[PDB]
């Protein structure tokens with residue numbers, strides 16, 4: 001029941017790495033895409 | 049369109065990669081992924097109404113929904129990958145030396161801490 | 173009636189403005205002489221044929237791809253368990269939700285398609301195959317639950333059953349649990 005405990009730990013840390021990685025990927029995707037569209041919207045609004 | 053889609057994606061991401069305890073078998077998170085994808089379909093359905101069958105370019109909102117669906121789909125696969133690693137314990141063989149070495153040094157960086165039962169087993 | 177053709181073809185396309193969903197591949201003109209039942213004299217007709225292709229990048233993205241992704245996710249859900257030695261849960265709610273979603277999707281494909289009852293469109297065959305796969309996967313999960321239930325009736329599996337179960341066990345990437353090895357040795 002110590003091999004099961006160790007593989008529980010590896011899966012637990014692997015879950016946390018996925019949580020951080022996907023949160024950062026989601027933040028960059030959602031904010032990055034919207035701010036690029038807003039940048040295009042803003043530039044061609046106030047400079048054309 | 050964008051705001052509820054981003055919120056639903058964020059809620060699903062936490063659902064995929066959060067458990068109630070470290071040392072109990074995780075439940076499958078695939079119906080969670082399939083329900084999130086049903087909702088996002090409902091949303092892209094309501095974005096096709098006020099948009100034509102644009103087959104020349106990919107609209108910015110189309111790239112937005114594509115990325116959210118990709119994140120949910122890979123998140124569903126990543127969640128199933130965690131269950132696979134936990135099943136390795138039931139096969140008897142311990143994790144390798146390097147596996148537990150890195151699992152202990154990336155453990156303080158990401159905010160996770162070793163449970164008491166694991167410490168007791170280590171000391172015993 | 174006689175046709176006047178242009179340099180690029182029968183129907184001039186030098187001023188055509190591009191369509192978002194259709195592309196013109198060519199044009200044709202055919203002068204005919206048809207005898208109709210009413211008049212005892214021929215009629216001169218001009219037949220202008222326009223060949224237009226569909227641009228299949230919107231439908232593939234919005235309909236085919238999410239359907240395939242949902243089908244793959246459901247397939248993985250049907251045939252993956254958290255362990256080998258505990259009773260499996262029913263996977264029929266999972267099959268029914270996948271089928272609700274795919275219905276929602278075929279619903280949004282009936283909008284941009286007529287009631288074609290002469291042939292089966294390619295996307296119709298695609299959705300039919302996906303639905304059949306999901307249904308047979310649900311039935312196969314129920315079959316796995318049944319085979320597990322066979323264990324509670326006492327009688328062991330036959331000799332050939334365990335021999336094949338052990339020799340197809342290394343081909344598919346599965347390995348025998350430690351408790352089974354301990355029971356065998358004991």
Ligand SMILES: *[C@@H]1O[C@H](CO)[C@@H](O[C@@H]2O[C@H](CO)[C@@H](O)[C@H](O)[C@H]2NC(C)=O)[C@H](O)[C@H]1NC(C)=O
Pocket residue numbers: 205206207214
């Ligand atoms: C009225 O039109 C018909 C065609 O529908 C003509 O019949 C054809 O004539 C051509 C040229 O002689 C033949 O090669 C075809 O074999 C004929 N039959 C067909 C196409 O079915 C007919 O000649 C026309 N009438 C007159 C008075 O010219």
